[PDB]
PDB file of C-alpha atoms in Angstrom:
ATOM      1  CA  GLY A   1      79.729  17.181 -41.709  1.00 14.98           C
ATOM      2  CA  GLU A   2      81.544  15.039 -38.585  1.00 16.60           C
ATOM      3  CA  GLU A   3      84.594  16.942 -39.538  1.00 15.75           C
ATOM      4  CA  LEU A   4      82.915  19.984 -37.658  1.00 14.90           C
ATOM      5  CA  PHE A   5      82.692  18.160 -34.467  1.00 12.73           C
ATOM      6  CA  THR A   6      86.378  17.026 -34.427  1.00 11.57           C
ATOM      7  CA  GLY A   7      87.088  19.894 -31.654  1.00 13.23           C
ATOM      8  CA  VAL A   8      85.449  21.479 -29.056  1.00 16.43           C
ATOM      9  CA  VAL A   9      82.295  23.628 -30.388  1.00 18.77           C
ATOM     10  CA  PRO A  10      81.049  26.763 -28.503  1.00 17.53           C
ATOM     11  CA  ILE A  11      77.304  26.252 -28.327  1.00 17.54           C
ATOM     12  CA  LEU A  12      74.387  28.791 -27.909  1.00 18.12           C
ATOM     13  CA  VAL A  13      70.918  27.980 -26.940  1.00 18.01           C
ATOM     14  CA  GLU A  14      68.283  30.230 -27.155  1.00 18.76           C
ATOM     15  CA  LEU A  15      64.455  29.800 -25.946  1.00 21.12           C
ATOM     16  CA  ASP A  16      60.950  31.562 -26.113  1.00 23.34           C
ATOM     17  CA  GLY A  17      58.216  30.071 -24.194  1.00 25.28           C
ATOM     18  CA  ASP A  18      54.835  30.896 -22.868  1.00 28.62           C
ATOM     19  CA  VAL A  19      53.234  28.114 -20.394  1.00 26.68           C
ATOM     20  CA  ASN A  20      49.780  29.054 -19.121  1.00 21.73           C
ATOM     21  CA  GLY A  21      49.778  32.826 -19.865  1.00 27.18           C
ATOM     22  CA  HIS A  22      53.538  33.272 -18.592  1.00 24.57           C
ATOM     23  CA  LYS A  23      55.809  34.342 -21.205  1.00 27.14           C
ATOM     24  CA  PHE A  24      59.646  33.633 -20.904  1.00 28.90           C
ATOM     25  CA  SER A  25      63.191  33.575 -22.403  1.00 28.65           C
ATOM     26  CA  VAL A  26      66.106  31.564 -21.596  1.00 29.37           C
ATOM     27  CA  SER A  27      69.667  32.068 -22.982  1.00 30.66           C
ATOM     28  CA  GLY A  28      72.347  29.080 -22.726  1.00 31.13           C
ATOM     29  CA  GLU A  29      75.637  29.034 -23.215  1.00 28.56           C
ATOM     30  CA  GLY A  30      78.884  26.590 -23.376  1.00 28.04           C
ATOM     31  CA  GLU A  31      80.564  23.912 -25.383  1.00 26.66           C
ATOM     32  CA  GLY A  32      80.453  20.416 -26.899  1.00 28.86           C
ATOM     33  CA  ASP A  33      82.852  17.770 -27.233  1.00 31.88           C
ATOM     34  CA  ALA A  34      81.483  15.162 -29.632  1.00 33.44           C
ATOM     35  CA  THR A  35      84.669  13.143 -29.125  1.00 31.75           C
ATOM     36  CA  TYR A  36      83.961  12.280 -25.602  1.00 31.15           C
ATOM     37  CA  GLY A  37      79.915  13.111 -26.026  1.00 31.62           C
ATOM     38  CA  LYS A  38      80.627  15.842 -23.304  1.00 33.09           C
ATOM     39  CA  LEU A  39      78.307  18.769 -22.826  1.00 35.04           C
ATOM     40  CA  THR A  40      78.894  21.763 -20.477  1.00 37.58           C
ATOM     41  CA  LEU A  41      75.950  24.368 -20.515  1.00 37.10           C
ATOM     42  CA  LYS A  42      74.656  27.391 -18.375  1.00 35.94           C
ATOM     43  CA  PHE A  43      71.267  28.495 -18.816  1.00 35.53           C
ATOM     44  CA  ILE A  44      69.779  31.912 -17.540  1.00 35.84           C
ATOM     45  CA  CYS A  45      66.314  32.828 -17.509  1.00 36.01           C
ATOM     46  CA  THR A  46      66.593  36.520 -18.942  1.00 37.56           C
ATOM     47  CA  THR A  47      62.680  37.308 -18.150  1.00 42.02           C
ATOM     48  CA  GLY A  48      63.181  36.786 -14.257  1.00 42.33           C
ATOM     49  CA  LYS A  49      62.059  33.921 -12.379  1.00 43.12           C
ATOM     50  CA  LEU A  50      61.172  30.277 -14.807  1.00 43.30           C
ATOM     51  CA  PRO A  51      57.621  29.626 -14.345  1.00 42.60           C
ATOM     52  CA  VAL A  52      58.557  25.701 -15.082  1.00 41.36           C
ATOM     53  CA  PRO A  53      61.228  23.675 -13.079  1.00 39.49           C
ATOM     54  CA  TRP A  54      64.469  23.729 -14.904  1.00 38.61           C
ATOM     55  CA  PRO A  55      64.763  19.867 -14.824  1.00 36.63           C
ATOM     56  CA  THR A  56      61.303  19.685 -17.227  1.00 34.84           C
ATOM     57  CA  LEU A  57      63.105  21.745 -19.884  1.00 35.96           C
ATOM     58  CA  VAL A  58      66.500  19.500 -19.996  1.00 36.40           C
ATOM     59  CA  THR A  59      65.590  17.527 -23.242  1.00 38.73           C
ATOM     60  CA  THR A  60      64.489  20.684 -24.907  1.00 38.90           C
ATOM     61  CA  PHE A  61      67.296  22.849 -24.190  1.00 43.07           C
ATOM     62  CA  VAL A  62      71.591  19.199 -29.435  1.00 40.67           C
ATOM     63  CA  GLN A  63      72.122  15.796 -30.056  1.00 42.66           C
ATOM     64  CA  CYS A  64      74.758  16.497 -32.508  1.00 43.29           C
ATOM     65  CA  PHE A  65      77.143  16.317 -29.884  1.00 42.03           C
ATOM     66  CA  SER A  66      76.637  12.633 -28.772  1.00 44.36           C
ATOM     67  CA  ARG A  67      79.561  10.237 -29.104  1.00 45.28           C
ATOM     68  CA  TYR A  68      79.167   7.674 -32.099  1.00 48.45           C
ATOM     69  CA  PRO A  69      81.656   5.170 -31.583  1.00 46.95           C
ATOM     70  CA  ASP A  70      83.522   4.453 -34.755  1.00 47.61           C
ATOM     71  CA  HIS A  71      81.501   1.488 -35.701  1.00 46.50           C
ATOM     72  CA  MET A  72      78.371   3.080 -35.633  1.00 44.01           C
ATOM     73  CA  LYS A  73      79.833   6.566 -37.873  1.00 42.01           C
ATOM     74  CA  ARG A  74      77.009   5.274 -40.320  1.00 38.06           C
ATOM     75  CA  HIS A  75      74.097   6.254 -38.165  1.00 36.88           C
ATOM     76  CA  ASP A  76      75.091   9.582 -36.860  1.00 38.18           C
ATOM     77  CA  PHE A  77      72.040  11.302 -38.289  1.00 39.06           C
ATOM     78  CA  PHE A  78      72.533  14.711 -36.481  1.00 40.64           C
ATOM     79  CA  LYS A  79      75.966  15.375 -37.441  1.00 37.45           C
ATOM     80  CA  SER A  80      75.324  14.227 -41.105  1.00 34.28           C
ATOM     81  CA  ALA A  81      72.705  17.193 -41.142  1.00 33.80           C
ATOM     82  CA  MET A  82      75.253  19.715 -40.693  1.00 34.40           C
ATOM     83  CA  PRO A  83      76.208  22.673 -41.223  1.00 36.92           C
ATOM     84  CA  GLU A  84      72.570  23.333 -42.572  1.00 34.49           C
ATOM     85  CA  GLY A  85      71.216  21.958 -39.408  1.00 30.64           C
ATOM     86  CA  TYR A  86      67.833  20.167 -38.814  1.00 27.47           C
ATOM     87  CA  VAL A  87      64.745  20.672 -36.961  1.00 27.49           C
ATOM     88  CA  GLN A  88      63.806  19.022 -33.602  1.00 30.68           C
ATOM     89  CA  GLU A  89      59.684  19.061 -32.950  1.00 28.58           C
ATOM     90  CA  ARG A  90      58.562  17.350 -29.626  1.00 29.33           C
ATOM     91  CA  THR A  91      55.618  16.759 -27.657  1.00 30.78           C
ATOM     92  CA  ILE A  92      56.151  16.246 -23.962  1.00 31.86           C
ATOM     93  CA  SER A  93      53.054  15.082 -22.014  1.00 28.96           C
ATOM     94  CA  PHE A  94      53.378  15.550 -18.422  1.00 28.67           C
ATOM     95  CA  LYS A  95      51.146  12.399 -16.897  1.00 26.54           C
ATOM     96  CA  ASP A  96      48.102  13.956 -15.295  1.00 27.23           C
ATOM     97  CA  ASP A  97      49.122  17.236 -16.230  1.00 27.51           C
ATOM     98  CA  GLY A  98      49.652  19.540 -18.982  1.00 28.31           C
ATOM     99  CA  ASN A  99      51.949  19.527 -21.997  1.00 30.22           C
ATOM    100  CA  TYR A 100      54.959  20.862 -23.891  1.00 29.14           C
ATOM    101  CA  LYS A 101      55.116  21.813 -27.677  1.00 28.41           C
ATOM    102  CA  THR A 102      58.504  22.562 -28.786  1.00 29.05           C
ATOM    103  CA  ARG A 103      60.070  23.274 -32.353  1.00 26.79           C
ATOM    104  CA  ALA A 104      63.974  24.129 -32.547  1.00 27.65           C
ATOM    105  CA  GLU A 105      66.121  24.518 -35.156  1.00 28.66           C
ATOM    106  CA  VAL A 106      69.680  23.217 -34.758  1.00 32.06           C
ATOM    107  CA  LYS A 107      72.517  24.626 -36.877  1.00 33.24           C
ATOM    108  CA  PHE A 108      75.764  26.267 -37.311  1.00 34.93           C
ATOM    109  CA  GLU A 109      76.372  30.120 -37.290  1.00 34.71           C
ATOM    110  CA  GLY A 110      79.986  30.239 -38.466  1.00 34.13           C
ATOM    111  CA  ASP A 111      81.807  28.112 -35.596  1.00 33.76           C
ATOM    112  CA  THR A 112      78.967  28.407 -32.976  1.00 32.85           C
ATOM    113  CA  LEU A 113      76.429  25.443 -33.095  1.00 35.81           C
ATOM    114  CA  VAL A 114      72.997  27.138 -32.428  1.00 36.53           C
ATOM    115  CA  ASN A 115      69.932  25.852 -30.679  1.00 33.30           C
ATOM    116  CA  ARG A 116      66.867  28.040 -31.377  1.00 35.84           C
ATOM    117  CA  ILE A 117      63.538  26.885 -29.534  1.00 32.98           C
ATOM    118  CA  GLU A 118      59.963  27.879 -29.338  1.00 27.88           C
ATOM    119  CA  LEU A 119      58.133  26.560 -26.491  1.00 28.05           C
ATOM    120  CA  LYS A 120      54.222  26.363 -25.852  1.00 28.85           C
ATOM    121  CA  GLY A 121      52.706  25.166 -22.366  1.00 28.51           C
ATOM    122  CA  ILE A 122      48.954  24.051 -22.315  1.00 27.55           C
ATOM    123  CA  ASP A 123      46.521  22.873 -19.954  1.00 25.84           C
ATOM    124  CA  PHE A 124      48.977  22.698 -16.601  1.00 24.21           C
ATOM    125  CA  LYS A 125      47.350  22.506 -13.525  1.00 20.92           C
ATOM    126  CA  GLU A 126      48.694  25.943 -11.491  1.00 19.74           C
ATOM    127  CA  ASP A 127      48.706  23.733  -8.304  1.00 17.48           C
ATOM    128  CA  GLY A 128      50.625  21.213 -10.008  1.00 20.57           C
ATOM    129  CA  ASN A 129      53.819  19.645  -9.817  1.00 18.67           C
ATOM    130  CA  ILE A 130      55.188  21.509 -12.747  1.00 17.73           C
ATOM    131  CA  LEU A 131      53.517  25.185 -12.344  1.00 19.17           C
ATOM    132  CA  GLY A 132      53.925  24.220  -8.428  1.00 19.90           C
ATOM    133  CA  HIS A 133      57.711  23.532  -8.676  1.00 23.80           C
ATOM    134  CA  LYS A 134      57.555  19.832  -6.717  1.00 24.57           C
ATOM    135  CA  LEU A 135      60.181  18.713  -9.092  1.00 24.37           C
ATOM    136  CA  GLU A 136      63.512  17.698  -7.227  1.00 23.78           C
ATOM    137  CA  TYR A 137      66.631  19.454  -8.685  1.00 23.05           C
ATOM    138  CA  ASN A 138      68.241  16.557  -9.898  1.00 25.25           C
ATOM    139  CA  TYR A 139      67.908  14.187 -13.375  1.00 25.43           C
ATOM    140  CA  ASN A 140      68.022  10.384 -13.811  1.00 28.83           C
ATOM    141  CA  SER A 141      69.854   8.649 -16.824  1.00 29.59           C
ATOM    142  CA  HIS A 142      68.018   7.566 -20.095  1.00 30.48           C
ATOM    143  CA  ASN A 143      68.189   5.429 -22.981  1.00 32.32           C
ATOM    144  CA  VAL A 144      66.557   7.186 -26.105  1.00 33.61           C
ATOM    145  CA  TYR A 145      65.964   4.863 -28.936  1.00 35.70           C
ATOM    146  CA  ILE A 146      66.268   6.226 -32.229  1.00 35.43           C
ATOM    147  CA  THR A 147      64.510   4.822 -35.458  1.00 37.91           C
ATOM    148  CA  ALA A 148      64.625   6.458 -39.197  1.00 36.88           C
ATOM    149  CA  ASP A 149      61.471   8.081 -40.778  1.00 38.47           C
ATOM    150  CA  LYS A 150      62.107   7.252 -44.775  1.00 35.59           C
ATOM    151  CA  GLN A 151      59.043   9.358 -46.062  1.00 38.73           C
ATOM    152  CA  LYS A 152      59.956  12.352 -43.759  1.00 39.34           C
ATOM    153  CA  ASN A 153      63.776  12.085 -44.766  1.00 40.72           C
ATOM    154  CA  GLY A 154      64.933  12.108 -41.102  1.00 39.34           C
ATOM    155  CA  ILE A 155      64.754  10.425 -37.330  1.00 40.22           C
ATOM    156  CA  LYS A 156      61.702  10.018 -34.956  1.00 39.67           C
ATOM    157  CA  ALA A 157      62.343   9.050 -31.074  1.00 39.12           C
ATOM    158  CA  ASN A 158      59.537   8.540 -28.108  1.00 34.47           C
ATOM    159  CA  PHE A 159      60.801   7.935 -24.731  1.00 35.19           C
ATOM    160  CA  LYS A 160      59.639   8.541 -20.913  1.00 37.02           C
ATOM    161  CA  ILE A 161      61.496  10.452 -18.860  1.00 33.45           C
ATOM    162  CA  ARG A 162      61.140  10.173 -14.955  1.00 32.00           C
ATOM    163  CA  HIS A 163      61.406  13.236 -12.838  1.00 32.57           C
ATOM    164  CA  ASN A 164      61.590  12.909  -9.082  1.00 30.90           C
ATOM    165  CA  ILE A 165      58.904  14.533  -7.170  1.00 32.05           C
ATOM    166  CA  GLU A 166      59.182  15.822  -3.635  1.00 32.56           C
ATOM    167  CA  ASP A 167      56.693  13.552  -2.390  1.00 31.88           C
ATOM    168  CA  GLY A 168      58.713  10.443  -3.216  1.00 32.91           C
ATOM    169  CA  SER A 169      56.627   9.510  -6.526  1.00 32.26           C
ATOM    170  CA  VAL A 170      57.927   9.882  -9.918  1.00 29.72           C
ATOM    171  CA  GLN A 171      56.402  11.977 -12.556  1.00 31.24           C
ATOM    172  CA  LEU A 172      56.495  10.724 -16.171  1.00 29.56           C
ATOM    173  CA  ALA A 173      57.094  13.238 -19.242  1.00 27.70           C
ATOM    174  CA  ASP A 174      56.405  11.369 -22.417  1.00 26.16           C
ATOM    175  CA  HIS A 175      58.192  12.445 -25.423  1.00 24.62           C
ATOM    176  CA  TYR A 176      57.529  12.150 -28.966  1.00 23.02           C
ATOM    177  CA  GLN A 177      60.441  13.702 -30.976  1.00 21.58           C
ATOM    178  CA  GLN A 178      60.756  13.904 -34.684  1.00 19.64           C
ATOM    179  CA  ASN A 179      63.960  15.459 -36.562  1.00 18.58           C
ATOM    180  CA  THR A 180      64.174  16.589 -40.304  1.00 20.35           C
ATOM    181  CA  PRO A 181      67.466  18.193 -42.230  1.00 18.02           C
ATOM    182  CA  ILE A 182      67.030  21.861 -42.953  1.00 16.93           C
ATOM    183  CA  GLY A 183      69.527  21.303 -45.965  1.00 17.69           C
ATOM    184  CA  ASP A 184      68.816  19.400 -49.170  1.00 19.22           C
ATOM    185  CA  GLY A 185      72.275  17.741 -48.957  1.00 20.18           C
ATOM    186  CA  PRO A 186      71.456  13.933 -48.423  1.00 21.52           C
ATOM    187  CA  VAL A 187      71.844  12.911 -44.640  1.00 25.54           C
ATOM    188  CA  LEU A 188      72.573   9.587 -43.204  1.00 25.09           C
ATOM    189  CA  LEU A 189      68.953   7.504 -42.246  1.00 21.50           C
ATOM    190  CA  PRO A 190      70.317   5.347 -39.207  1.00 22.41           C
ATOM    191  CA  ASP A 191      69.646   1.884 -38.284  1.00 18.85           C
ATOM    192  CA  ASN A 192      67.765   1.692 -35.096  1.00 16.87           C
ATOM    193  CA  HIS A 193      69.930   2.126 -32.152  1.00 14.20           C
ATOM    194  CA  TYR A 194      69.616   4.383 -28.771  1.00 13.60           C
ATOM    195  CA  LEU A 195      71.788   7.116 -27.248  1.00 12.54           C
ATOM    196  CA  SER A 196      72.645   6.431 -23.415  1.00 10.82           C
ATOM    197  CA  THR A 197      72.780   9.958 -21.734  1.00  9.11           C
ATOM    198  CA  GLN A 198      73.298  11.211 -18.331  1.00  8.52           C
ATOM    199  CA  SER A 199      72.637  14.599 -16.620  1.00  7.31           C
ATOM    200  CA  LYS A 200      74.185  16.430 -13.500  1.00  7.30           C
ATOM    201  CA  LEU A 201      72.334  19.496 -12.616  1.00  6.22           C
ATOM    202  CA  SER A 202      73.794  22.498 -10.211  1.00  8.48           C
ATOM    203  CA  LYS A 203      74.135  25.818  -9.475  1.00  5.45           C
ATOM    204  CA  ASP A 204      76.647  28.398 -10.210  1.00  5.80           C
ATOM    205  CA  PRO A 205      77.157  30.095  -6.437  1.00  3.29           C
ATOM    206  CA  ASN A 206      77.974  33.415  -8.147  1.00  2.00           C
ATOM    207  CA  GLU A 207      75.283  33.738 -10.394  1.00  2.00           C
ATOM    208  CA  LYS A 208      72.067  35.698  -8.873  1.00  2.00           C
ATOM    209  CA  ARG A 209      69.911  35.147 -12.189  1.00  2.00           C
ATOM    210  CA  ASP A 210      67.664  32.034 -12.315  1.00  2.00           C
ATOM    211  CA  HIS A 211      69.952  29.565 -13.661  1.00  2.00           C
ATOM    212  CA  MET A 212      70.836  26.019 -14.665  1.00  3.09           C
ATOM    213  CA  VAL A 213      74.031  24.570 -15.101  1.00  6.12           C
ATOM    214  CA  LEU A 214      74.324  20.922 -17.108  1.00 10.09           C
ATOM    215  CA  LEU A 215      77.118  18.784 -17.321  1.00  9.16           C
ATOM    216  CA  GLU A 216      76.002  16.159 -20.025  1.00  9.73           C
ATOM    217  CA  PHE A 217      77.374  12.820 -21.590  1.00 10.10           C
ATOM    218  CA  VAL A 218      75.892  11.062 -24.082  1.00  7.27           C
ATOM    219  CA  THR A 219      76.788   7.809 -25.975  1.00 11.43           C
ATOM    220  CA  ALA A 220      75.087   5.883 -28.876  1.00 11.75           C
ATOM    221  CA  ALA A 221      75.066   2.299 -28.654  1.00 11.16           C
ATOM    222  CA  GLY A 222      73.309  -0.760 -29.769  1.00 10.27           C
ATOM    223  CA  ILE A 223      74.786  -2.141 -32.522  1.00 10.65           C
ATOM    224  CA  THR A 224      77.008  -4.417 -31.014  1.00  8.05           C
ATOM    225  CA  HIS A 225      77.038  -8.204 -32.202  1.00  5.54           C
ATOM    226  CA  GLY A 226      79.556  -7.142 -35.221  1.00  7.42           C
ATOM    227  CA  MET A 227      82.052  -6.012 -33.027  1.00  7.51           C
ATOM    228  CA  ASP A 228      81.516  -8.778 -30.381  1.00  6.31           C
ATOM    229  CA  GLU A 229      82.343 -11.388 -33.408  1.00  8.65           C
ATOM    230  CA  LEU A 230      85.853 -10.073 -33.454  1.00 10.44           C
ATOM    231  CA  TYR A 231      86.609 -11.323 -29.953  1.00  9.99           C
ATOM    232  CA  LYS A 232      85.265 -14.987 -29.937  1.00 11.53           C
TER     233      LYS A 232
END
């Protein structure tokens, strides 16, 4: 399970979306190195111009690449579900605007880790920050808290992403997330903890299609009192 992530793993991301009548598709490719919690991914809109801002799709576009420190090995649900994979479902509610409903399956196809996503967008304002592309092209860091879900054999998370807006304000995107294994093999159900994420957005100067370059680092954290005792 975890042994599938000891080296660099090629990643493929595929999303099909429909946001207020606008149908679109995105393909992403890169690689993950879970030993450093490092993701390098480049996304291309294969249907033309993206109808929503790129930053709003960052969370939707593979937490199995998070760095789980050795003392937290027993809490890494995402890798324990591999190679069969897990389903990741989200609702993302944008304050004073519409919402996304996403469903993804993340699993290995051979050596490639594949994230296949369906996105539906509803009730957006045609003049709002999303459909109006009024978000800044950047991304803040966040701590995502993970909890187990015994009765559904998986985990859940909820967190509020802060998106910077052109006019100086901040647009909150409230995420509710649920992950469940695809396989029937047992998986690690974690103790409460969090994932510390940082993301940098950039552009490829040679890319003519609408696109996003993403560099991301994720580390699991929060289980500390045991280690701290060693240094008293």
